[PDB]
Structure formats: structure tokens, C-alpha cells
Amino acid sequence: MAFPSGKVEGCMVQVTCGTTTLNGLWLDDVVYCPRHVICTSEDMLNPNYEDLLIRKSNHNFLVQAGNVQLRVIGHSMQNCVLKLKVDTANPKTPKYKFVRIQPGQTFSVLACYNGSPSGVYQCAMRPNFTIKGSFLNGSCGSVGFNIDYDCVSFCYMHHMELPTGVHAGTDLEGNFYGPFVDRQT
Ligand SMILES: *[C@H](O)[C@H](C[C@@H]1CCNC1=O)NC(=O)[C@H](CC(C)C)NC(=O)OCc1ccccc1
């Protein structure tokens, strides 16, 4: 059984850089999202993320909370996630923590597209660090979480689909679960 999603729905935004759009997680005044948002389609083959990072400015990122655009005032990279500092703190930020889960553990996923929540379901982390998700194009940045009383424990951010149809992603510090890397290879 999935957890109720209301506390997490209020944290989802859309992030666009160039023609790449995915989802971000807005907590306090930081938006967390997968770093491959800064890739064009050609970059995705063998990205040099350090080089792409230098060439971006704050105004290259478009962050929207529904119809409201949020101004980006800084950005940094932490492992495989980008952290965009915005000028507005999310007034719906729940009590939360970032946790790294173990194979065998379950968590709920709020699947989102264009910054808008679409569905909620339960997943399990397999021994090879993959999950059998229901993720389509545009789902990157969707998060996995558990609820402990009133505290939302975020444990997964979605990045990619593997050839066999299963899914891989990172914790919220941007470290992959398993030996994968964020390149379309
Ligand atoms: C981000 O929205 C997207 C999610 C994928 C697309 C298909 N289903 C998903 O879960 N991720 C990517 O496009 C990712 C980007 C790299 C720079 C990591 N590449 C990826 O998952 O491989 C391309 C692919 C597309 C469709 C089916 C299988 C693989």
C-alpha cells in the first residue's frame, strides 16, 4: 500500500533548461533535480558535466511551480543532482529528511510529468539496485519516499530506464543506487 502523497505533491516543480524538461523537488529555497537537465540530446551520449556546468547561468534555468515562475539565484552540482537556489522558500515544505535505503526496502513513488503529479504506487529496491517502476519520458526528477509519523523520508530520485525495462536513480545526495552512471549508454 502506497503512502498518501499530499505532503510531497506540494513540493514538485517543473525545471527546463533549453529544450530539456523534467521535474524538481522544491524544499525550503532549494530545487533538487537530475543534473542531466543541462544536457542537449547530443551531450547525453558522453556528457562532460563539469564543462556543461561552467557554461550555464542562473537565467538559463526556468523553474515553474504550477504557473508561477521562480527566480533562480544560484546553482551548484552535488554528485548527480543539481541544486538550484531560488528566491522564494516553499511555504508547503514538510518536515523531511534524506535517507539512503537498502535492497529489500519498499517506498512510495509520486510519478510526475511537467511538474504535475500523475499517480502514486509502491516499489521495492531489488538486490541489483534496480526498481520496477512505471516511468515514461518526462518522469525524471520524480521522487520516492516513506512517511514516518509526520516526517517525509525522501530516498529516491528518478534518472533513467535500463534496456530490460527496469529503472535506476539516485538518493537525494545524488549518489546512484548501484553501479550506474547518468549517460545514455
Ligand atoms: C528522464 O525523464 C528520462 C526517464 C526515462 C525515459 C524513458 N523512461 C525513463 O524512465 N531519462 C532519460 O532519458 C535518460 C537520460 C540520461 C542522460 C541518463 N536516459 C535513459 O533512460 O535512456 C534513454 C531511454 C529512453 C527510453 C527507454 C529506455 C531508455
Residue numbers in the entry: 6 to 190
According to the publication:
In Severe Acute Respiratory Syndrome CoronaVirus 2 (SARS-CoV-2) and its closely related SARS-CoV, a single copy of the main protease (MPro, nsp5) encoded within the polyprotein (pp) 1a and 1ab mediates its self-cleavage (autoprocessing) at its termini (nsp4/nsp5 and nsp5/nsp6) and other cleavages between nsp6 and nsp16. The fully active mature MPro is a homodimer, with one active site per monomer, and exhibits a monomer-dimer dissociation constant (Kdimer) in the low micromolar range.
To find out whether inhibitor binding to the truncated enzyme can restore the geometry of the oxyanion loop and the overall configuration of the active site to their native states, we obtained room-temperature X-ray crystal structures of MPro1–196 in complex with covalent inhibitors GC373 and NMV at 1.80 and 1.85 Å resolutions, respectively. MPro1–196-GC373 and MPro1–196-NMV complexes crystallize in the isomorphic monoclinic unit cells with a P21 space group. Superimposition of the independent molecules in MPro1–196-GC373 (and in MPro1–196-NMV) with a monomer from the mature MProWT dimer39 clearly shows that the native dimer is not formed by the juxtaposition of the two independent molecules in these crystal structures. Thus, in agreement with our solution measurements, GC373 and NMV can covalently bind to the monomeric MPro1–196. Moreover, due to inhibitor presence, the C-termini in the MPro1–196-inhibitor complexes are better defined in the electron density maps, so we were able to model up to Gly195 (molecule B) in MPro1–196-GC373 and up to Thr196 (molecule B) in MPro1–196-NMV, the entire length of the construct at the C-terminus. A close inspection of the oxyanion loops in the MPro1–196-GC373 and MPro1–196-NMV complexes reveals that residues 139–142 adopt the native conformation in both structures. In MPro1–196-GC373, the oxygen atom of the inhibitor’s hemithioacetal conjugate makes a 3.0 Å hydrogen bond with the main chain amide NH of Cys145 and longer (3.4–3.5 Å) contacts with the main chains of Gly143 and Ser144. Hence, the structural analysis demonstrates that binding of the covalent inhibitors to the monomeric enzyme leads to the conformational changes culminating in restoring the native structure of the active site and very similar enzyme-inhibitor interactions to those in MProWT.
